[PDB]
């Protein structure tokens, strides 16, 4: 996160960090969607042109973290993974279409003040809230920044999104970020990849994950926007995996 502010404790209790187990290394953000399931971007786990193809035993997650440079005893939770599931039509060759992956925890986690799942959108919530100008929130760590950072970013008009890149964009992506001369700045960056873009519903006041940080051009550069996996468009596969596996 660039041009954000420190998160308050417990502000993003669905925030998950993905680590390579050996050797230790922060890879990506992710999100808690139940006691047993974590949502992330497929490119965090699989990207063949770079020979990237992590398996479950390569990885750990850390949940309930507020500070980056410390094991947070009594607050943080570390979990191993049973299985990774990548969208079968994830298009790593062209444009990262359907950049989505689920991770099944080895054991269910206990909820606390600091650990609590985010909601996934239904049709009505997606249609109401996914509109240009409407702001969501992304969380992650700062450049080179020991405390979790937060930034609020408005959803961008689709022709403006398309216009900003040579990449073929699909209905499975949206973009967010401030236009130049809006004054305000802010963006997701690199290590925030895989992390959640959340919105608070005005209908029931619950937080919904609408996006997954997917790709962009650099960091908080004028006229460029971060691109996000459209979680609702992919909910059928999410629900299928969670229903089929997860025993």
């Amino acid at each position: 996160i660039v041009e954000g502010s420190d998160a308050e404790i417990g502000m993003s209790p669905w925030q998950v960090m993905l680590f390579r187990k050996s050797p230790q290394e922060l890879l990506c953000g992710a999100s808690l969607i139940s006691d047993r399931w974590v949502l992330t971007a497929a490119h965090c786990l699989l990207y063949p042109p770079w020979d990237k193809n992590f398996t479950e035993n390569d990885l750990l997650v850390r949940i309930g973290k507020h500070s980056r440079t410390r094991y947070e005893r009594n607050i943080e939770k570390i979990s191993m993974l049973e299985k990774i599931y990548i969208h079968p039509r994830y298009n790593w060759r062209e444009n990262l279409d359907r950049d989505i992956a689920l991770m099944k925890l080895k054991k269910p986690v206990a909820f606390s003040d600091y650990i609590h799942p985010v909601c996934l959108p239904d049709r009505e919530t997606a249609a109401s809230l996914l509109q240009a100008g409407y702001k969501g929130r992304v969380t992650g760590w700062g450049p080179l920044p020991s405390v979790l950072q937060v930034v609020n970013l408005p959803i961008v008009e689709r022709p403006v999104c398309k216009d900003s890149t040579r990449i073929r964009i699909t209905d499975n992506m949206f973009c967010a970020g401030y236009k130049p001369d809006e004054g305000k700045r802010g963006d997701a960056c690199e290590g925030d990849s895989g992390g959640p873009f959340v919105m608070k519903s005005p209908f029931n006041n619950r937080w919904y994950q609408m996006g997954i940080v997917s790709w962009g051009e650099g960091c908080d550069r004028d006229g460029k926007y971060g691109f996000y996996t459209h979680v609702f468009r992919l909910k059928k596969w999410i629900q299928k995996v969670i229903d089929q596996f997860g025993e």
């Binding site: 502010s5 308050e8 209790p13 969607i33 702001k135 005005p202």
Partner: peptide
């Protein structure tokens, strides 16, 4: 599941975070 998206330190205690109003203000314009 049934209790998703409600933060124990915020919605569950009738407390606002420092910037959530800005999000909701953006929908009601």
């Amino acid at each position: 599941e049934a209790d998703c998206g409600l933060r124990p330190l915020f919605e569950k205690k009738s407390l606002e975070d420092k910037t959530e109003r800005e999000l909701l203000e953006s929908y009601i314009d």
